[PDB]
From a paper:
EFhd2/Swiprosin-1 (EFhd2) is a cytoskeletal Ca2+-binding protein identified in human immune, brain and mast cells. EFhd2 and EFhd1 consist of a disordered N-terminal region followed by two EF-hands and a coiled-coil domain at the C-terminus. We also reported previously that the EF-hands of EFhd2 are involved directly in F-actin bundling in a Ca2+-dependent manner and the coiled-coil domain is essential to the F-actin bundling activity by homodimerisation. Based on the experimental results, we propose that the F-actin bundling activity of EFhd2 depends on structural rigidity conferred by binding of two Ca2+ ions to the EF-hand domains.
We failed to determine the structure of the apo form of EFhd2 owing to structural instability during protein purification; however, we could determine the crystal structures of CDEFhd2 mutants defective for one Ca2+-binding site (E116A for EF1, CDEFhd2EF1; E152A for EF2, CDEFhd2EF2). The overall structures of these two mutants in the presence of Ca2+ are similar to that of Ca2+-bound CDEFhd2 (CDEFhd2EF1, root mean square deviation (RMSD) = 0.34 Å for 102 Cα atoms; CDEFhd2EF2, RMSD = 0.61 Å for 105 Cα atoms), which implies a single Ca2+-loaded EF-hand is sufficient to maintain a stable fold. Although the crystal structures of EF-hand mutants (CDEFhd2EF1 and CDEFhd2EF2) are similar to Ca2+-bound CDEFhd2, we observed structural flexibility in the Ca2+-binding loop of EF1 and the C-terminal linker. Furthermore, comparison of the crystallographic B-factors between Ca2+-bound and EF-hand mutant structures showed that the largest changes in B-factor values were for CDEFhd2EF1 (35.6 Å2), CDEFhd2 (20.4 Å2) and CDEFhd2EF2 (21.5 Å2). To evaluate the effect of Ca2+ on structural dynamics of EFhd2 at the atomic level, we performed ensemble refinement for CDEFhd2, CDEFhd2EF1 and CDEFhd2EF2 using Phenix.ensemble refinement. As expected, Ca2+-bound CDEFhd2 displayed a rigid conformation and CDEFhd2EF1 showed the largest degrees of mobility, indicating that Ca2+ depletion of EF1 has a larger impact on conformational dynamics. In addition, CDEFhd2EF2 also showed a moderate degree of mobility. Interestingly, the C-terminal linker (residues, 176–184) followed by the LM-helix also showed significant RMSF increases in CDEFhd2EF1 and CDEFhd2EF2. Consistent with a previous study showing that thermostability of EFhd2 was restored by Ca2+ at a high temperature, the half aggregation temperature for both EF-hand mutants that bind only one Ca2+ is significantly lower (CDEFhd2EF1: 62.32 ± 0.14 °C, CDEFhd2EF2: 57.90 ± 0.60 °C) than the two Ca2+-bound EFhd2 (CDEFhd2: 84.89 ± 0.01 °C) and is consistent with ref. Even depletion of one Ca2+ site in a two Ca2+-binding protein showed a dramatic reduction in F-actin bundling activity to a level that is similar to that of previously reported data for a two Ca2+-depleted state26.
Author numbering: 80 to 184
Write the structure that this text describes.
Amino acid sequence: FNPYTEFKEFSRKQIKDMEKMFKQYDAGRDGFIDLMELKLMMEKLGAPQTHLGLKNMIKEVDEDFDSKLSFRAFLLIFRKAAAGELQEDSGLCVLARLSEIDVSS
Ligand SMILES: [Ca+2]
């Protein structure tokens, strides 16, 4: 898929930064962040989430029904963040905040 045409609100630098973080936490190297990998990510960032909380984070952006996060789903988190669509202090809000990738340009 082409992230550059699908997510025109982000510069190529920003998309590559997001790719850097995505790859860092896809420990399995399969191109997805699954529930267990996302559990570890939230722990490492210092904001651990419950079983079902993590499932709901994935559900919110998993528009392709992978039951895990593709890179498209990951970018969608930042799109929702940048557009004010995430619930205040929700798991996805916290992920985007603690990622250190600034989308509040
Ligand atoms: Ca993976």
